[PDB]
Design a protein around this ligand. Structure first.
Ligand SMILES: [Cl-]
Ligand SMILES: [Cl-]
Ligand SMILES: [Cl-]
Length: 129
C-alpha cells in the first residue's frame, strides 16, 4: 500500500506513536517519507547482507527474521514479511521497541540526516487528526 501523508499520520496516531518517547508525530511521518516513500512494500538490501523492510525500513540484522541473514537476531519476534503488510501494526510495534533501545530515532539514518532538527510539524499540517 502506498499511503497518503495524512492517512499515515492518522494511522500512526491511532497506534500510539504521537509523542512516543517524546517524538512528535511529524518525526514519524518524516522518517517514513524518506525511508520508504510511504510504501509498505519497500525493501532494500544492505552491504552486510541484511535487508530493510517496510514503511520504516526495519533491518533483519537485529529486528526480524528473513531466513537469509546469518547470525542475526529477531528482537521483534516476527518474520520480516509481516512488515510489508498494508496494516502497519507490526511495523509500529517493532518501531516502539527500536526507539526504546537507547539511540532513540537516530536508529533511522534517513531521520537523522533529513528530519532531525527540521520543522517536522510541517509533515502533519492540514491533516485531520
Ligand atoms: Cl509534529
Ligand atoms: Cl534477523
Ligand atoms: Cl531520545
Amino acid at each position: 500500500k502506498v499511503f497518503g501523508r495524512c492517512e499515515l499520520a492518522a494511522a500512526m496516531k491511532r497506534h500510539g506513536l504521537d509523542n512516543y518517547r517524546g517524538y512528535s508525530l511529524g518525526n514519524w511521518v518524516c522518517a517514513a517519507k524518506f525511508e520508504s516513500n510511504f510504501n509498505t512494500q519497500a525493501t532494500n538490501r544492505n552491504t552486510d547482507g541484511s535487508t530493510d523492510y517496510g514503511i520504516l525500513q526495519i533491518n533483519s540484522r537485529w529486528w526480524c527474521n528473513d531466513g537469509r541473514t546469518p547470525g542475526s537476531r529477531n528482537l521483534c519476534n516476527i518474520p520480516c514479511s509481516a512488515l510489508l503488510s498494508s496494516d502497519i501494526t507490526a511495523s509500529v510495534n517493532c518501531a516502539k521497541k527500536i526507539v526504546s533501545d537507547g539511540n532513540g530515532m537516530n536508529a533511522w539514518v534517513a531521520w537523522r540526516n533529513r528530519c532531525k532538527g527540521t520543522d517536522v510539524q510541517a509533515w502533519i499540517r492540514g491533516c485531520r487528526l
